[PDB]
Coordinates of N, CA and C and ligand atoms in Angstrom, one line a residue:
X1 N -3.5 24.9 -5.8 CA -4.4 23.7 -6.0 C -5.5 23.6 -5.0
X2 N -6.7 24.0 -5.3 CA -7.8 23.8 -4.4 C -8.5 22.5 -4.7
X3 N -8.3 21.5 -3.8 CA -8.8 20.2 -4.0 C -10.3 20.1 -4.0
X4 N -11.0 21.1 -3.4 CA -12.4 21.2 -3.5 C -12.9 21.2 -5.0
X5 N -12.2 22.0 -5.8 CA -12.6 22.0 -7.2 C -12.2 20.7 -7.9
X6 N -11.1 20.1 -7.5 CA -10.8 18.8 -8.0 C -11.9 17.7 -7.7
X7 N -12.4 17.7 -6.4 CA -13.4 16.8 -6.1 C -14.7 17.1 -6.8
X8 N -15.0 18.4 -7.0 CA -16.2 18.8 -7.8 C -16.1 18.2 -9.2
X9 N -14.9 18.2 -9.8 CA -14.7 17.7 -11.1 C -14.8 16.2 -11.1
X10 N -14.3 15.5 -10.1 CA -14.3 14.0 -10.1 C -15.7 13.5 -9.8
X11 N -16.5 14.3 -9.1 CA -17.8 13.8 -8.5 C -18.8 13.2 -9.6
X12 N -19.0 13.9 -10.8 CA -19.9 13.3 -11.7 C -19.6 11.9 -12.3
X13 N -18.4 11.5 -12.1 CA -18.0 10.1 -12.6 C -18.1 9.0 -11.6
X14 N -18.5 9.3 -10.3 CA -18.6 8.3 -9.3 C -19.7 7.4 -9.6
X15 N -19.5 6.1 -9.5 CA -20.4 5.0 -9.8 C -20.3 4.6 -11.3
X16 N -19.4 5.2 -12.1 CA -19.3 4.8 -13.5 C -18.2 3.8 -13.7
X17 N -18.4 2.9 -14.6 CA -17.3 2.0 -15.0 C -16.2 2.7 -15.7
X18 N -15.0 2.1 -15.5 CA -13.8 2.7 -16.2 C -13.6 1.9 -17.5
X19 N -13.7 2.5 -18.7 CA -13.6 1.8 -19.9 C -12.2 1.5 -20.3
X20 N -11.3 2.5 -20.2 CA -9.9 2.3 -20.5 C -9.1 3.4 -19.9
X21 N -7.7 3.3 -19.9 CA -6.8 4.2 -19.2 C -5.8 4.7 -20.1
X22 N -5.1 5.8 -19.7 CA -4.0 6.3 -20.4 C -3.1 7.1 -19.5
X23 N -2.0 7.6 -20.0 CA -1.0 8.4 -19.3 C 0.4 7.7 -19.4
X24 N 1.3 8.4 -18.8 CA 2.7 8.0 -18.8 C 3.2 7.4 -17.5
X25 N 2.4 7.3 -16.5 CA 2.7 6.7 -15.2 C 2.2 5.3 -15.2
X26 N 3.2 4.4 -15.6 CA 2.9 3.0 -15.6 C 3.5 2.2 -14.4
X27 N 3.9 3.0 -13.3 CA 4.5 2.4 -12.2 C 3.5 1.6 -11.4
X28 N 2.2 2.0 -11.4 CA 1.1 1.3 -10.7 C 0.4 0.4 -11.6
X29 N 0.6 0.4 -12.9 CA -0.1 -0.3 -13.9 C -1.6 0.0 -13.9
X30 N -2.0 1.2 -14.3 CA -3.4 1.5 -14.2 C -4.3 0.7 -15.0
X31 N -3.8 -0.2 -15.9 CA -4.7 -1.1 -16.6 C -5.4 -2.1 -15.7
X32 N -5.1 -2.2 -14.4 CA -5.9 -3.0 -13.5 C -7.3 -2.5 -13.3
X33 N -7.4 -1.2 -13.5 CA -8.7 -0.5 -13.3 C -9.7 -0.7 -14.4
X34 N -9.4 -1.4 -15.4 CA -10.3 -1.6 -16.5 C -11.5 -2.5 -16.0
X35 N -12.7 -2.2 -16.5 CA -13.9 -2.9 -16.1 C -14.1 -2.8 -14.5
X36 N -13.7 -1.7 -13.9 CA -14.0 -1.4 -12.5 C -14.7 -0.1 -12.4
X37 N -15.4 0.1 -11.3 CA -16.2 1.2 -11.0 C -15.6 2.2 -10.0
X38 N -15.7 3.5 -10.3 CA -15.2 4.5 -9.4 C -16.2 4.6 -8.2
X39 N -16.0 3.8 -7.2 CA -17.1 3.6 -6.2 C -17.1 4.8 -5.2
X40 N -16.0 5.5 -5.0 CA -16.0 6.6 -4.1 C -14.9 7.6 -4.4
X41 N -15.1 8.8 -4.0 CA -14.1 9.9 -4.1 C -14.1 10.8 -2.9
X42 N -13.0 11.0 -2.2 CA -12.9 11.8 -1.0 C -11.7 12.6 -1.0
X43 N -11.7 13.7 -0.2 CA -10.6 14.6 -0.1 C -10.3 14.9 1.4
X44 N -9.0 14.7 1.8 CA -8.6 15.0 3.2 C -7.2 15.5 3.1
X45 N -7.0 16.8 3.4 CA -5.7 17.3 3.7 C -4.7 17.2 2.5
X46 N -4.9 17.9 1.4 CA -4.0 18.0 0.3 C -3.8 16.6 -0.4
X47 N -4.7 15.7 -0.2 CA -4.7 14.4 -0.9 C -6.1 14.0 -1.4
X48 N -6.1 13.4 -2.5 CA -7.4 12.9 -3.2 C -7.4 11.4 -3.2
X49 N -8.5 10.8 -2.7 CA -8.6 9.4 -2.6 C -9.7 8.9 -3.5
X50 N -9.4 7.9 -4.3 CA -10.4 7.4 -5.2 C -10.5 5.9 -5.0
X51 N -11.7 5.3 -5.0 CA -11.9 3.9 -4.7 C -12.5 3.2 -5.9
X52 N -11.9 2.1 -6.3 CA -12.4 1.3 -7.5 C -12.7 -0.1 -7.0
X53 N -13.9 -0.6 -7.5 CA -14.3 -1.9 -7.1 C -15.6 -2.3 -7.8
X54 N -16.1 -3.5 -7.5 CA -17.3 -4.0 -8.0 C -18.2 -4.4 -6.8
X55 N -18.9 -3.5 -6.2 CA -19.8 -3.8 -5.1 C -21.3 -3.8 -5.5
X56 N -21.9 -5.0 -5.3 CA -23.3 -5.2 -5.6 C -24.1 -4.9 -4.4
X57 N -25.4 -5.3 -4.4 CA -26.3 -5.2 -3.2 C -25.7 -5.8 -2.0
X58 N -26.0 -5.2 -0.8 CA -25.6 -5.7 0.5 C -24.1 -5.7 0.7
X59 N -23.3 -5.1 -0.2 CA -21.9 -5.1 -0.1 C -21.2 -6.3 -0.7
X60 N -21.9 -7.1 -1.5 CA -21.3 -8.4 -2.0 C -20.7 -8.1 -3.4
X61 N -19.6 -8.8 -3.7 CA -19.0 -8.7 -5.0 C -19.9 -9.3 -6.1
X62 N -19.5 -9.1 -7.3 CA -20.4 -9.6 -8.4 C -20.4 -11.1 -8.5
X63 N -19.3 -11.8 -8.4 CA -19.2 -13.2 -8.3 C -18.6 -13.6 -7.0
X64 N -19.2 -14.6 -6.3 CA -18.8 -14.8 -4.9 C -18.5 -16.3 -4.7
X65 N -17.5 -16.5 -3.9 CA -17.1 -17.9 -3.4 C -16.8 -17.8 -2.0
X66 N -17.5 -18.6 -1.1 CA -17.4 -18.5 0.3 C -16.1 -19.0 0.9
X67 N -15.7 -20.3 0.6 CA -16.3 -21.4 -0.2 C -17.1 -22.4 0.6
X68 N -13.0 -8.4 -3.1 CA -12.4 -7.6 -2.1 C -13.3 -6.5 -1.6
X69 N -12.8 -5.5 -1.0 CA -13.5 -4.3 -0.6 C -13.2 -3.1 -1.5
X70 N -12.5 -3.2 -2.5 CA -12.1 -2.2 -3.4 C -10.7 -1.7 -3.3
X71 N -10.1 -1.1 -4.3 CA -8.8 -0.6 -4.3 C -8.8 0.9 -4.1
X72 N -7.8 1.5 -3.4 CA -7.7 2.9 -3.1 C -6.5 3.4 -3.9
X73 N -6.7 4.5 -4.7 CA -5.6 5.2 -5.3 C -5.5 6.6 -4.7
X74 N -4.3 7.0 -4.3 CA -4.0 8.2 -3.7 C -3.4 9.2 -4.7
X75 N -3.9 10.4 -4.7 CA -3.3 11.5 -5.6 C -2.8 12.6 -4.7
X76 N -1.5 12.8 -4.6 CA -0.9 13.8 -3.8 C -0.5 15.0 -4.8
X77 N -1.3 16.1 -4.7 CA -1.1 17.2 -5.7 C 0.0 18.1 -5.1
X78 N 1.0 18.4 -6.0 CA 2.0 19.4 -5.6 C 1.5 20.8 -5.8
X79 N 2.5 21.7 -6.0 CA 2.2 23.1 -6.2 C 1.5 23.3 -7.5
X80 N 1.8 22.6 -8.5 CA 1.2 22.7 -9.8 C 0.4 21.6 -10.3
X81 N 0.0 20.7 -9.3 CA -0.9 19.6 -9.7 C -2.3 20.1 -10.1
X82 N -2.9 19.3 -10.9 CA -4.3 19.7 -11.4 C -4.9 18.4 -11.9
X83 N -6.3 18.5 -12.1 CA -7.1 17.5 -12.7 C -8.0 18.2 -13.7
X84 N -8.3 17.6 -14.9 CA -9.1 18.1 -15.9 C -10.3 17.1 -16.1
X85 N -11.4 17.7 -16.6 CA -12.6 16.9 -16.9 C -12.9 17.0 -18.4
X86 N -12.8 15.9 -19.1 CA -13.1 15.7 -20.5 C -12.3 16.7 -21.4
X87 N -11.3 17.3 -20.9 CA -10.4 18.3 -21.6 C -9.0 18.1 -21.2
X88 N -8.1 18.4 -22.1 CA -6.6 18.3 -21.9 C -6.0 19.7 -21.7
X89 N -5.1 19.8 -20.8 CA -4.4 21.1 -20.6 C -3.4 21.3 -21.7
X90 N -3.0 22.5 -21.9 CA -2.0 22.9 -22.9 C -0.9 23.6 -22.3
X91 N 0.3 23.7 -22.9 CA 1.5 24.2 -22.3 C 1.4 25.7 -22.2
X92 N 2.2 26.3 -21.4 CA 2.3 27.7 -21.2 C 3.6 28.3 -21.5
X93 N 4.2 28.0 -22.7 CA 5.4 28.5 -23.3 C 6.6 28.3 -22.3
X94 N 6.9 27.0 -22.1 CA 8.2 26.7 -21.4 C 9.3 26.4 -22.4
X95 N 6.1 22.2 -25.6 CA 5.2 21.1 -25.9 C 4.2 20.9 -24.8
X96 N 3.1 20.4 -25.1 CA 2.0 20.2 -24.2 C 2.4 19.3 -23.1
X97 N 1.9 19.5 -21.8 CA 2.2 18.6 -20.7 C 1.5 17.3 -20.9
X98 N 2.1 16.2 -20.5 CA 1.6 14.9 -20.6 C 1.0 14.5 -19.3
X99 N -0.3 14.0 -19.3 CA -0.9 13.6 -18.1 C -0.3 12.4 -17.4
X100 N -0.2 12.4 -16.1 CA 0.2 11.3 -15.4 C -0.7 10.1 -15.5
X101 N -2.0 10.4 -15.5 CA -3.0 9.4 -15.6 C -4.3 9.9 -16.4
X102 N -4.9 9.1 -17.2 CA -6.2 9.4 -17.8 C -7.1 8.2 -17.6
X103 N -8.3 8.5 -17.1 CA -9.3 7.5 -16.8 C -10.5 7.8 -17.7
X104 N -10.9 6.8 -18.5 CA -12.0 7.0 -19.5 C -13.3 6.4 -18.9
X105 N -14.3 7.1 -18.9 CA -15.7 6.7 -18.7 C -16.5 7.0 -19.9
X106 N -17.7 6.3 -20.0 CA -18.6 6.5 -21.1 C -19.0 8.0 -21.2
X107 N -19.3 8.6 -20.0 CA -19.7 10.0 -19.9 C -18.5 10.9 -20.3
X108 N -17.3 10.6 -19.8 CA -16.2 11.5 -20.1 C -14.9 10.9 -19.5
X109 N -13.9 11.7 -19.3 CA -12.6 11.2 -18.8 C -12.0 12.3 -17.9
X110 N -11.1 11.8 -17.0 CA -10.4 12.6 -16.1 C -8.9 12.4 -16.3
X111 N -8.2 13.6 -16.3 CA -6.8 13.6 -16.6 C -6.1 14.3 -15.4
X112 N -5.0 13.7 -14.8 CA -4.4 14.2 -13.7 C -2.9 14.6 -14.0
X113 N -2.6 15.9 -13.6 CA -1.3 16.5 -14.0 C -0.5 16.8 -12.8
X114 N 0.8 16.5 -13.0 CA 1.9 16.8 -12.0 C 1.5 16.4 -10.6
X115 N 1.2 15.1 -10.4 CA 0.8 14.6 -9.1 C 1.5 13.3 -8.9
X116 N 1.6 12.9 -7.6 CA 2.1 11.6 -7.2 C 0.9 10.7 -7.1
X117 N 1.1 9.5 -7.7 CA 0.0 8.5 -7.8 C 0.5 7.2 -7.3
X118 N -0.1 6.7 -6.2 CA 0.3 5.5 -5.6 C -0.9 4.8 -4.9
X119 N -0.9 3.5 -4.8 CA -1.9 2.8 -4.0 C -1.7 3.1 -2.5
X120 N -2.9 3.0 -1.8 CA -2.9 3.3 -0.4 C -4.0 2.5 0.3
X121 N -4.0 2.5 1.6 CA -5.0 1.8 2.3 C -6.4 2.5 2.2
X122 N -6.4 3.8 2.2 CA -7.6 4.6 2.0 C -7.7 5.7 3.0
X123 N -8.9 6.4 3.0 CA -9.1 7.6 3.9 C -9.3 7.2 5.3
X124 N -9.8 6.0 5.6 CA -10.1 5.6 6.9 C -8.9 5.6 7.9
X125 N -7.8 5.3 7.4 CA -6.5 5.3 8.2 C -5.8 6.6 7.9
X126 N -5.1 7.1 8.9 CA -4.3 8.3 8.8 C -3.2 8.0 7.8
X127 N -2.9 9.0 6.9 CA -1.7 8.7 6.0 C -0.4 8.6 6.7
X128 N -0.2 9.2 7.8 CA 1.0 9.1 8.6 C 1.3 7.7 9.0
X129 N 0.2 6.9 9.3 CA 0.4 5.6 9.7 C 0.5 4.6 8.5
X130 N 0.0 5.0 7.4 CA 0.0 4.1 6.2 C 1.4 3.8 5.7
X131 N 1.7 2.5 5.7 CA 3.1 2.2 5.2 C 3.2 2.3 3.7
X132 N 2.1 2.1 3.0 CA 2.1 2.3 1.5 C 2.2 3.7 1.1
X133 N 1.6 4.6 1.8 CA 1.6 6.0 1.4 C 2.9 6.6 1.5
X134 N 3.2 7.5 0.5 CA 4.5 8.2 0.5 C 4.7 9.1 1.8
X135 N 3.5 9.7 2.3 CA 3.5 10.5 3.4 C 3.5 9.6 4.7
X136 N 4.5 8.8 4.9 CA 4.6 7.9 6.0 C 5.5 8.5 7.1
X137 N 4.9 8.6 8.3 CA 5.6 9.2 9.4 C 6.7 8.3 10.0
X138 N 7.8 8.4 9.4 CA 8.9 7.5 9.8 C 9.5 7.9 11.2
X139 N 9.3 9.2 11.6 CA 9.6 9.6 12.9 C 8.8 8.9 13.9
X140 N 7.4 8.9 13.7 CA 6.5 8.1 14.5 C 6.9 6.6 14.5
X141 N 7.2 6.1 13.3 CA 7.5 4.7 13.2 C 8.7 4.3 14.0
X142 N 9.8 5.1 13.9 CA 11.0 4.8 14.7 C 10.8 5.0 16.2
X143 N 10.0 6.0 16.5 CA 9.7 6.2 17.9 C 9.0 5.0 18.5
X144 N 8.1 4.4 17.7 CA 7.4 3.2 18.1 C 8.4 2.0 18.2
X145 N 9.3 1.9 17.2 CA 10.2 0.8 17.1 C 11.3 0.8 18.2
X146 N 11.7 2.0 18.7 CA 12.6 2.1 19.8 C 12.1 1.6 21.1
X147 N 10.8 1.3 21.2 CA 10.2 0.9 22.5 C 10.8 -0.4 23.0
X148 N 10.4 -0.8 24.3 CA 11.0 -2.0 24.9 C 10.5 -3.2 24.2
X149 N 9.3 -3.3 23.8 CA 8.7 -4.5 23.3 C 9.4 -5.1 22.1
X150 N 9.3 -6.4 21.9 CA 9.9 -7.1 20.7 C 9.4 -6.5 19.4
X151 N 10.2 -6.6 18.4 CA 9.9 -6.0 17.1 C 8.6 -6.4 16.5
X152 N 8.2 -7.7 16.6 CA 7.0 -8.2 16.1 C 5.8 -7.5 16.6
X153 N 5.8 -7.3 18.0 CA 4.6 -6.7 18.6 C 4.5 -5.2 18.1
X154 N 5.6 -4.5 18.0 CA 5.5 -3.1 17.5 C 5.1 -3.0 16.1
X155 N 5.7 -3.9 15.3 CA 5.4 -4.0 13.8 C 3.9 -4.2 13.6
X156 N 3.3 -5.1 14.4 CA 1.9 -5.4 14.3 C 0.9 -4.3 14.8
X157 N 1.5 -3.3 15.4 CA 0.7 -2.2 15.9 C 0.2 -1.3 14.7
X158 N -1.1 -1.4 14.5 CA -1.7 -0.6 13.3 C -1.7 0.9 13.5
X159 N -1.6 1.4 14.8 CA -1.6 2.8 15.0 C -0.3 3.5 14.3
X160 N 0.8 2.7 14.2 CA 2.0 3.3 13.6 C 2.5 2.5 12.4
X161 N 2.0 1.3 12.2 CA 2.4 0.5 11.0 C 1.2 -0.1 10.3
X162 N 0.2 0.8 10.0 CA -1.1 0.4 9.5 C -0.9 -0.4 8.2
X163 N -1.7 -1.4 8.1 CA -1.7 -2.3 6.9 C -0.7 -3.4 7.0
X164 N 0.2 -3.4 8.0 CA 1.2 -4.5 8.1 C 0.6 -5.7 8.8
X165 N 0.6 -6.8 8.1 CA 0.1 -8.0 8.6 C 1.1 -9.1 8.9
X166 N 0.7 -10.3 8.9 CA 1.6 -11.4 9.3 C 2.7 -11.6 8.3
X167 N 2.4 -11.7 7.0 CA 3.3 -12.1 6.0 C 4.4 -11.0 5.8
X168 N 4.0 -9.7 5.8 CA 4.9 -8.6 5.7 C 5.8 -8.7 6.9
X169 N 5.2 -8.9 8.1 CA 6.0 -9.0 9.3 C 7.2 -10.0 9.2
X170 N 6.8 -11.2 8.9 CA 7.8 -12.3 8.8 C 8.9 -12.0 7.7
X171 N 8.4 -11.6 6.5 CA 9.4 -11.4 5.4 C 10.3 -10.2 5.7
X172 N 9.7 -9.1 6.2 CA 10.6 -7.9 6.6 C 11.5 -8.3 7.7
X173 N 11.1 -9.1 8.6 CA 12.0 -9.5 9.7 C 13.2 -10.3 9.2
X174 N 12.9 -11.3 8.3 CA 14.0 -12.1 7.7 C 14.9 -11.2 6.9
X175 N 14.4 -10.3 6.1 CA 15.2 -9.5 5.2 C 16.2 -8.7 5.9
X176 N 15.9 -8.1 7.1 CA 16.8 -7.4 7.9 C 17.7 -8.4 8.8
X177 N 17.4 -9.7 8.7 CA 18.2 -10.7 9.5 C 18.2 -10.4 11.0
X178 N 17.0 -10.1 11.5 CA 16.9 -9.8 13.0 C 15.9 -10.8 13.5
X179 N 16.0 -11.1 14.8 CA 15.2 -12.1 15.5 C 13.8 -11.4 15.8
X180 N 12.7 -12.2 15.6 CA 11.4 -11.6 15.9 C 11.2 -11.1 17.3
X181 N 11.9 -11.8 18.3 CA 11.7 -11.4 19.7 C 12.8 -10.4 20.2
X182 N 13.7 -10.0 19.3 CA 14.7 -9.0 19.7 C 14.0 -7.7 20.1
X183 N 14.5 -7.0 21.1 CA 13.9 -5.8 21.6 C 14.3 -4.6 20.8
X184 N 13.4 -3.7 20.6 CA 13.7 -2.5 19.9 C 14.7 -1.5 20.5
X185 N 14.8 -1.6 21.9 CA 15.9 -0.9 22.5 C 17.2 -1.5 22.4
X186 N 17.3 -2.8 22.2 CA 18.6 -3.6 22.1 C 19.0 -3.8 20.7
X187 N 18.6 -3.0 19.8 CA 18.9 -3.1 18.4 C 19.7 -1.9 17.9
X188 N 20.6 -2.1 16.9 CA 21.4 -1.0 16.4 C 20.5 -0.1 15.5
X189 N 20.8 1.2 15.4 CA 20.1 2.1 14.5 C 20.2 1.6 13.0
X190 N 21.4 1.0 12.7 CA 21.5 0.4 11.3 C 20.5 -0.6 11.0
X191 N 20.3 -1.6 11.9 CA 19.3 -2.6 11.8 C 17.9 -2.0 11.8
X192 N 17.6 -1.0 12.6 CA 16.3 -0.3 12.6 C 16.0 0.3 11.3
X193 N 16.9 1.1 10.8 CA 16.7 1.8 9.5 C 16.6 0.7 8.4
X194 N 17.3 -0.3 8.4 CA 17.2 -1.4 7.4 C 15.8 -2.0 7.4
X195 N 15.4 -2.4 8.6 CA 14.0 -2.9 8.8 C 13.0 -2.0 8.3
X196 N 13.1 -0.7 8.7 CA 12.0 0.3 8.3 C 12.0 0.5 6.8
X197 N 13.1 0.5 6.2 CA 13.1 0.6 4.7 C 12.6 -0.6 4.0
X198 N 13.0 -1.8 4.5 CA 12.5 -3.1 4.0 C 11.0 -3.1 4.1
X199 N 10.4 -2.5 5.2 CA 8.9 -2.5 5.3 C 8.3 -1.8 4.0
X200 N 8.8 -0.6 3.7 CA 8.2 0.2 2.6 C 8.5 -0.5 1.3
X201 N 9.7 -1.1 1.1 CA 10.0 -1.8 -0.1 C 9.2 -3.0 -0.3
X202 N 9.2 -4.0 0.6 CA 8.5 -5.2 0.4 C 7.0 -5.0 0.4
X203 N 6.4 -4.0 1.1 CA 5.0 -3.8 1.1 C 4.5 -3.5 -0.4
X204 N 5.2 -2.5 -1.0 CA 4.8 -2.1 -2.3 C 5.1 -3.2 -3.4
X205 N 6.2 -3.9 -3.2 CA 6.5 -5.0 -4.1 C 5.5 -6.1 -4.0
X206 N 5.2 -6.5 -2.8 CA 4.2 -7.6 -2.6 C 2.8 -7.1 -3.1
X207 N 2.4 -5.9 -2.9 CA 1.2 -5.4 -3.4 C 1.1 -5.5 -4.9
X208 N 2.1 -5.0 -5.6 CA 2.1 -5.0 -7.0 C 2.1 -6.4 -7.6
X209 N 2.8 -7.3 -6.9 CA 2.8 -8.7 -7.3 C 1.4 -9.3 -7.1
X210 N 0.7 -9.0 -6.1 CA -0.6 -9.6 -5.8 C -1.6 -9.0 -6.7
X211 N -1.6 -7.7 -7.0 CA -2.6 -7.2 -7.9 C -2.6 -7.8 -9.2
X212 N -1.4 -7.9 -9.8 CA -1.2 -8.5 -11.1 C -1.4 -10.0 -11.1
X213 N -1.6 -10.6 -10.0 CA -1.8 -12.0 -9.9 C -0.6 -12.9 -10.1
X214 N 0.6 -12.3 -10.3 CA 1.8 -13.0 -10.6 C 2.1 -13.9 -9.4
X215 N 2.6 -15.1 -9.6 CA 3.0 -16.0 -8.4 C 4.1 -15.3 -7.6
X216 N 4.0 -15.3 -6.3 CA 4.9 -14.8 -5.4 C 5.7 -15.9 -4.7
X217 N 7.0 -15.7 -4.7 CA 7.9 -16.7 -4.0 C 8.2 -16.2 -2.6
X218 N 7.7 -17.0 -1.6 CA 7.9 -16.6 -0.2 C 9.3 -17.0 0.2
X219 N 10.0 -16.2 0.9 CA 11.4 -16.4 1.4 C 11.4 -17.3 2.7
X220 N 10.7 -16.8 3.7 CA 10.7 -17.4 5.0 C 9.3 -17.8 5.5
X221 N 8.2 -17.3 4.8 CA 6.9 -17.6 5.3 C 6.4 -19.0 4.8
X222 N 6.1 -19.8 5.8 CA 5.7 -21.2 5.6 C 6.7 -22.0 4.8
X223 N 8.0 -21.7 5.0 CA 9.1 -22.3 4.3 C 9.8 -23.2 5.3
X224 N 10.1 -24.5 4.9 CA 10.7 -25.4 5.8 C 12.2 -25.0 6.0
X225 N 12.9 -24.7 5.0 CA 14.3 -24.3 5.0 C 14.4 -22.8 4.5
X226 N 15.3 -22.1 5.1 CA 15.6 -20.7 4.7 C 16.2 -20.7 3.3
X227 N 16.4 -19.5 2.8 CA 17.2 -19.4 1.5 C 18.6 -19.9 1.6
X228 N 19.2 -19.7 2.7 CA 20.5 -20.4 2.9 C 20.4 -21.9 3.1
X229 N 19.3 -22.3 3.7 CA 19.0 -23.7 3.9 C 18.9 -24.2 5.3
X230 N 19.0 -23.3 6.3 CA 18.8 -23.7 7.7 C 17.4 -24.0 8.0
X231 N 17.1 -25.0 8.8 CA 15.8 -25.4 9.2 C 15.1 -24.2 9.9
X232 N 13.8 -24.0 9.5 CA 13.1 -22.8 9.9 C 12.2 -23.2 11.1
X233 N 12.2 -22.4 12.1 CA 11.4 -22.6 13.3 C 10.0 -21.9 13.3
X234 N 9.0 -22.5 13.9 CA 7.6 -22.0 13.8 C 7.1 -22.0 15.2
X235 N 6.5 -20.9 15.7 CA 5.9 -20.8 17.0 C 4.9 -19.5 16.9
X236 N 4.1 -19.4 18.0 CA 3.1 -18.3 18.0 C 3.5 -17.3 19.1
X237 N 3.5 -16.0 18.7 CA 3.8 -15.0 19.7 C 2.9 -13.8 19.3
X238 N 2.5 -13.0 20.4 CA 1.7 -11.8 20.2 C 1.7 -11.0 21.5
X239 N 1.1 -9.8 21.4 CA 1.1 -8.9 22.6 C -0.1 -9.2 23.5
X240 N -3.0 -11.0 21.4 CA -3.5 -12.0 20.5 C -2.4 -12.6 19.7
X241 N -2.3 -14.0 19.7 CA -1.1 -14.6 19.2 C -1.2 -14.9 17.7
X242 N -0.1 -14.8 17.0 CA 0.0 -15.1 15.6 C 1.2 -16.0 15.3
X243 N 1.0 -16.8 14.2 CA 2.1 -17.7 13.8 C 3.3 -17.0 13.2
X244 N 4.5 -17.5 13.6 CA 5.7 -16.8 13.2 C 6.7 -17.8 12.7
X245 N 7.5 -17.4 11.7 CA 8.6 -18.2 11.2 C 9.9 -17.4 11.3
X246 N 11.0 -18.1 11.6 CA 12.3 -17.4 11.7 C 13.4 -18.4 11.6
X247 N 14.5 -17.9 11.1 CA 15.7 -18.8 11.0 C 16.7 -18.3 12.1
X248 N 16.9 -19.1 13.2 CA 17.8 -18.7 14.3 C 19.2 -18.4 13.8
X249 N 19.7 -19.3 12.9 CA 21.1 -19.1 12.4 C 21.2 -17.7 11.7
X250 N 20.2 -17.4 10.8 CA 20.2 -16.1 10.1 C 19.8 -15.0 11.0
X251 N 19.0 -15.2 12.0 CA 18.4 -14.2 12.9 C 18.7 -14.5 14.3
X252 N 19.9 -14.0 14.8 CA 20.2 -14.2 16.2 C 19.5 -13.2 17.1
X253 N 19.3 -13.6 18.4 CA 18.4 -12.8 19.3 C 19.2 -11.5 19.7
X254 N 20.5 -11.6 20.0 CA 21.3 -10.4 20.2 C 20.8 -9.6 21.4
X255 N 20.8 -10.2 22.6 CA 20.6 -9.5 23.9 C 20.3 -8.0 23.8
Ligands
ZN301 ZN1 19.1 -19.6 7.6

């Protein structure tokens, strides 16, 4: 799979609106891409990055209230991954293969075969740091987590947990039932693995909930009482300070 050819195929569609979508991969719900423009396409290290959005002059969206910057889709091509332009592949005597995704433009369409398709932060950040990307360097992440500093400070480090902000920090911390100020050296590997997995789970879940616009129920973020019902405490901590919520009863400090 030479991704240079794939990029050459994708290039004529850059700047064109997406009319409709098809395929059998509905995990990302590609119908979000309707009436959006393929604003950019780039290739870096066995991955293909496509950007969809509505950017007008000066970088402003179409309709503005004072009162986004586009979505990035990552395509990780395996040994037999491929993309087609205005044509569909046929089987080689093993029924025709079904494309994972088909994007329709007025000029033509693109079909992607045998590839992993997931949202990502984009090319600007290294995929190893990206928490959304499947190619997430969990070795690097745990090496960062085992440091002396409290877990909130390490989690907010974009070099190793890129894309992780305040809300994900608080929710992932409550889900593992660990205190925000607990040290990464003074935590069990069980809790560390649970936290690291909850990162990847809650990130993609929250992203999918936010894209579809469905109302999201916050567990501990800006909540007066925890799910169990204990009063929630609020204070500011940082390595630059940020607002934090935690339940001391649910999340002991644990020396
Ligand atoms: Zn509680």
